[PDB]
Design an enzyme around this catalytic site. Structure first.
Site, mmCIF file in Angstrom:
data_model
loop_
_atom_site.group_PDB
_atom_site.id
_atom_site.type_symbol
_atom_site.label_atom_id
_atom_site.label_comp_id
_atom_site.label_asym_id
_atom_site.label_seq_id
_atom_site.Cartn_x
_atom_site.Cartn_y
_atom_site.Cartn_z
ATOM 1 C CD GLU A 131 -14.693 -3.605 4.421
ATOM 2 O OE1 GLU A 131 -13.542 -3.114 4.604
ATOM 3 O OE2 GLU A 131 -15.261 -3.617 3.315
ATOM 4 C CB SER A 189 -11.110 2.709 1.760
ATOM 5 O OG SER A 189 -11.045 2.896 3.168
ATOM 6 C CG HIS A 217 -10.307 -2.101 4.372
ATOM 7 N ND1 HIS A 217 -11.507 -1.498 4.113
ATOM 8 C CD2 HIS A 217 -9.356 -1.166 4.120
ATOM 9 C CE1 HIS A 217 -11.301 -0.251 3.717
ATOM 10 N NE2 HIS A 217 -10.005 -0.028 3.717
ATOM 11 N N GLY A 229 -6.930 5.328 1.193
ATOM 12 C CA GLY A 229 -5.808 5.609 2.028
ATOM 13 C C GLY A 229 -6.185 6.608 3.125
ATOM 14 N N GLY A 230 -7.462 6.643 3.523
ATOM 15 C CA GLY A 230 -7.823 7.434 4.742
ATOM 16 C C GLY A 230 -7.803 8.941 4.520
ATOM 17 C CD1 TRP A 267 -1.655 -2.384 2.062
ATOM 18 C CD2 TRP A 267 -2.828 -1.581 0.344
ATOM 19 N NE1 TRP A 267 -2.613 -3.355 1.727
ATOM 20 C CE2 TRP A 267 -3.336 -2.873 0.662
ATOM 21 C CE3 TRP A 267 -3.394 -0.873 -0.732
ATOM 22 C CZ2 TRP A 267 -4.417 -3.452 -0.034
ATOM 23 C CZ3 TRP A 267 -4.447 -1.452 -1.440
ATOM 24 C CH2 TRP A 267 -4.959 -2.732 -1.075
#
Ligand SMILES: *[C@@H]1O[C@H](CO[C@H]2O[C@@H](C)[C@@H](O)[C@@H](O)[C@@H]2O)[C@@H](O[C@@H]2O[C@H](CO)[C@@H](O)[C@H](O)[C@H]2NC(C)=O)[C@H](O)[C@H]1NC(C)=O
Ligand SMILES: *[C@@H]1O[C@H](CO[C@H]2O[C@@H](C)[C@@H](O)[C@@H](O)[C@@H]2O)[C@@H](O[C@@H]2O[C@H](CO)[C@@H](O)[C@H](O)[C@H]2NC(C)=O)[C@H](O)[C@H]1NC(C)=O
Ligand SMILES: *[C@@H]1O[C@H](CO[C@H]2O[C@@H](C)[C@@H](O)[C@@H](O)[C@@H]2O)[C@@H](O)[C@H](O)[C@H]1NC(C)=O
Ligand SMILES: *[C@@H]1O[C@H](CO)[C@@H](O)[C@H](O)[C@H]1NC(C)=O
Ligand SMILES: *[C@@H]1O[C@H](CO)[C@@H](O)[C@H](O)[C@H]1NC(C)=O
Ligand SMILES: *[C@@H]1O[C@H](CO)[C@@H](O)[C@H](O)[C@H]1NC(C)=O
Ligand SMILES: *[C@@H]1O[C@H](CO)[C@@H](O)[C@H](O)[C@H]1NC(C)=O
Ligand SMILES: *[C@@H]1O[C@H](CO)[C@@H](O)[C@H](O)[C@H]1NC(C)=O
Ligand SMILES: [Cl-]
Ligand SMILES: [Cl-]
Ligand SMILES: [Cl-]
Ligand SMILES: [Cl-]
Ligand SMILES: [Cl-]
Ligand SMILES: [Cl-]
Ligand SMILES: [Cl-]
Ligand SMILES: [Cl-]
Ligand code: NA
Ligand code: NA
Lengths: 526, 175, 175
Positions: free
Chosen positions: A323, A196, A436, A114-115, A80
């Site tokens: 998740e 996400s 997730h 990525g939030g 990631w």
């Protein structure tokens, strides 16, 4: 040699062999002025002609962002992390087109998660050459700014107005409107898809009047703006902007001076203080996120959704079976990717503290009451499973179901999936289940590549998912019509039918997590 | 197929084979072993039970349909034989309610629930377990064909059990 | 079947045979001759036309379906070939309207009606013959699947043309 004339100049691409065929990839085309210096924290500015043949032959820089150093050397986490240099000069996008050049192809635009703090379009699991090859769609993906640099907000003040990274995504969607016919694309058939935070972003482009005419349909994988991590209040944003200022010695009395000061800091000093702008964080913290800025977002988006103010179109929404597990190894006590993480009641309670900072004691007992009535108290993985479900149901699953419910009540077709296949190659341990982020490689077709060591059942699952996503984008209906497949019913309030995605056979079921989401959705919002 | 379908034209038997051996995919070594068991169960028990329930309910009576999917922790037969014919019976009669007996706790609870559901059916014509926030058991209708799954984890409402298989046994096979 | 279904597994071809040769009854010598023609017509033309109409109409448009059953008095082909492919065309184009041409009177009238129905369809989207107390042509819907028969005596409204045959070609055969 493939050169395309765009509104802003020419671009050269590169040919790729995929599955005995050819795809043309135009990697790293710029879509805005680099947002450097005096443009830092500002809305992206449109791009002027080069002229000039721009060589789009490699991925561009990723936007500045902190990186996950929890498991150095470990593929499960490091996969990631960005794989191009970091730089404020990161406003580029990628186009993959079938060869021969299509006539009026449907366009899929990917928005990464990525939030809102991390991510990049160049990751290997986001590579859109399989889709373009196999389904003859065009795939586009863009880097947008993340962290404070993309979302710092000093409300109403155009020096830091907020949502900049959402305006980067938007300017990329315009670029597709203006330019994609030149590559053989149909700007009237554009589907956004995202996972996400990328999904949450898709859901806000559904609410944003300025995005209304930049796309046709939407796909939301594991996320929607109503998730508890996805929108920062004006209160919090102010507190956080000032905390950042304070931490970088940029406190001022005049707010425009705060921003001016911050524009002088080095990317790195900003990144380094992001984590602390908040007294306590969680593994799911989103310190700098979307805000109601009066521009991109005109009102608290929960009100817009409830009262039906959003783009009227079809949506495809889904979630994965486990998740919440991925997050538990970033700070819950007793949890490890390196053992089976059998935790105790007391550990479970400590975990709630990690994930629900505050959160009255009564709030936290109520979660415990709801999730720990075992059937029965025998099973040692009881508490370990419960903490993962708590985190997944609260953060992802119930907010996705409630979004779909509320969106569909205004008359549009919506389709809901529950993804329940654990990849044969997952590097994370078994107890973490169907995690997730791990449907993504199936949607992008990676298992279609035999050289890759996925099973045959996984190739077939991926092939089906790709067809369903592609038919959704082209025709608004995620059916696989040729191989006697289960028909995917629309999701309605009332029945709440959904389709399960797994290698054996897919089922139609109803009312996913009914009892759990009644808790998160009706009661918890203590 | 020869053992189970004595005669049975060759075409009859190819047709079973055609229906049950289109794998997804041809990789799996237990493919043919699983297929023969499903052939024998769908033909002999499952589709005729579904078709009975369908036809009985069309005349206006409430019917309830279950799909029992728990393998007893004490089954003496091997694992590949799965949730066998005859092995719901001990659950219906309550044997797992007897702790001295080495059934798991999840099995005591499953049996207790099944006993309540059978008893409420007998006393009141409705196989609900009304007290422990249980899944409500819907009537089975032509059209939706809803059924309840019985297992230790949690029971689901599903629809159209063996739809593709029973269309074969029920419409075509009766070659 | 070998001529018409090149390959086509043996099982594929037996299945056609099974579906088309259960006589009622095995007496009739033209049994197999009729069956081969129906196989070829149902597979190649009739069921695919019905399935197109079914699927098109499900999206909300009016569709009208006809079954043409008149053998031209002048057909040069022999009687056993019946109402052949291609031989409605001269009726649609009006050739029988020309008396100098040796079609019967019933054929002039049939053609005149068909021409009116095609013309009203083109002008108004509705293939009615409104003036001569004609049978009204209903729209074709999934569900009832009503169609109009075209013949010299009198035209009927019927339902579910080739129902059993097309279930074979349409659901099963696509072996
Ligand atoms: C708004 O911020 C304050 C926290 O003040 C912060 O100073 C920043 C520069 C940063 O370093 C940060 O870590 C520090 O907390 C929040 O109130 C805080 O609550 C705790 C409770 O004991 C105190 O220890 C903090 O110091 C206290 N603030 C102070 C120093 O006055 C406040 O909660 C936050 N508001 C929110 C949550 O929106
Ligand atoms: C599973 O591992 C966790 C994670 O912490 C440990 O990682 C292990 C693989 C091992 O290398 C250990 O040194 C490392 O700290 C264990 O949780 C830990 O439990 C230990 C045992 O005392 C405590 O000392 C730690 O405080 C605690 N770690 C933290 C900070 O979360 C866990 O016990 C282990 N559980 C099993 C095997 O079921
Ligand atoms: C390309 O098609 C245009 C219309 O697109 C429609 O059709 C589908 C693609 C569908 O997904 C919808 O998105 C659209 O409503 C048409 O107007 C253009 O003229 C075409 N351009 C070409 C072929 O050059
Ligand atoms: C741009 O890159 C291409 C592809 O590698 C190369 O062939 C071409 O000469 C380059 N043009 C220049 C000089 O920028
Ligand atoms: C704040 O300072 C900026 C610096 O340019 C200035 O433009 C603005 O007018 C000031 N406003 C006041 C009086 O707070
Ligand atoms: C349909 O199944 C075939 C084989 O029977 C497979 O090769 C093909 O990829 C499938 N198509 C889709 C879209 O699933
Ligand atoms: C209901 O659950 C209780 C414990 O909560 C259990 O002891 C009891 O046997 C159950 N009743 C039925 C009929 O399942
Ligand atoms: C209606 O019938 C008349 C005679 O009664 C005939 O001459 C005429 O052609 C018919 N019209 C149509 C369109 O069939
Ligand atoms: Cl990978
Ligand atoms: Cl306690
Ligand atoms: Cl237990
Ligand atoms: Cl559930
Ligand atoms: Cl396989
Ligand atoms: Cl089934
Ligand atoms: Cl006879
Ligand atoms: Cl018929
Ligand atoms: Na409560
Ligand atoms: Na058959």
């Amino acid at each position: 040699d493939i050169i395309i004339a765009t509104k802003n100049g020419k671009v050269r691409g590169m040919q790729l062999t995929v599955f005995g065929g050819t795809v043309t990839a135009f990697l790293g085309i710029p879509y805005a002025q680099p947002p450097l210096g005096r443009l830092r924290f500002k809305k992206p500015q449109s791009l002027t002609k080069w002229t000039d043949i721009w060589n789009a032959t490699k991925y561009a820089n990723s936007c500045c962002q902190n990186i996950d150093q929890s498991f150095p050397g470990f593929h499960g986490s490091e996969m990631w992390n960005p794989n191009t240099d970091l730089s404020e000069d990161c406003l580029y996008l990628n186009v993959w087109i079938p060869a021969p050049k299509p006539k009026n192809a449907t366009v899929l635009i990917w928005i990464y998660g990525g939030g809102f703090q991390t991510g990049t379009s160049s990751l290997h699991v986001y590579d859109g050459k399989f889709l373009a090859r196999v389904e003859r769609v065009i795939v586009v993906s863009m880097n947008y700014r993340v962290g404070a640099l993309g979302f710092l907000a000093l409300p109403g003040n155009p020096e830091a107005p907020g949502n900049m990274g959402l305006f980067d995504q938007q300017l990329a969607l315009q670029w597709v409107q203006k330019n994609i016919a030149a590559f053989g694309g149909n700007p009237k058939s554009v589907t956004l898809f995202g996972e996400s935070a990328g999904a949450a972003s898709v859901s806000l482009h559904l609410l944003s009047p300025g995005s209304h005419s930049l796309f046709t349909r939407a796909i939301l994988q594991s996320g929607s703006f109503n998730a508890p991590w996805a929108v920062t209040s004006l209160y919090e944003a102010r507190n956080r902007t000032l905390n950042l200022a304070k931490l970088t010695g940029c406190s001022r009395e005049n707010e425009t001076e705060i921003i001016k000061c911050l524009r002088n800091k080095d990317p790195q000093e900003i990144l380094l203080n992001e984590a602390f702008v908040v007294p306590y964080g969680t593994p799911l913290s989103v310190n700098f996120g979307p805000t109601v800025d009066g521009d991109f977002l005109t009102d608290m988006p929960d009100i817009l959704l409830e009262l039906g103010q959003f783009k009227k179109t079809q949506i495809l929404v889904g979630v994965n079976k486990d998740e919440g597990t991925a997050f538990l190894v970033y700070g819950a006590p007793g949890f490890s990717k390196d053992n089976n993480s059998i935790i105790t009641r007391k550990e479970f309670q400590e975990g709630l503290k990690i994930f629900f900072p505050g959160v009255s004691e009564f709030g936290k007992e109520s979660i415990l009451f709801h999730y720990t009535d075992w059937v029965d108290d025998q099973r040692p993985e009881n508490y370990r499973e419960a903490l993962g479900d708590v985190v997944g149901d609260y953060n992802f699953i119930c907010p996705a179901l409630e979004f779909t419910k509320k969106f569909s009540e205004w008359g549009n077709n919506a389709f809901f999936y529950y993804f329940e296949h654990r990849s044969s190659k997952l590097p994370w341990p078994e107890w973490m289940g169907v995690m997730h982020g791990y449907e993504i490689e199936f949607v992008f077709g990676l298992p279609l590549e035999r050289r890759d060591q996925y099973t045959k059942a996984e190739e077939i699952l991926s092939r089906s998912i790709v067809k369903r996503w592609a038919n959704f984008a082209k025709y608004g209906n995620p059916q696989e019509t040729q191989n006697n497949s289960t028909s995917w019913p629309v999701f309605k309030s009332t029945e709440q039918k959904y389709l399960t995605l797994n290698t054996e056979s897919t089922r139609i079921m109803t009312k996913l997590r009914a009892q759990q989401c009644r808790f998160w959705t009706s009661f918890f919002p203590v």
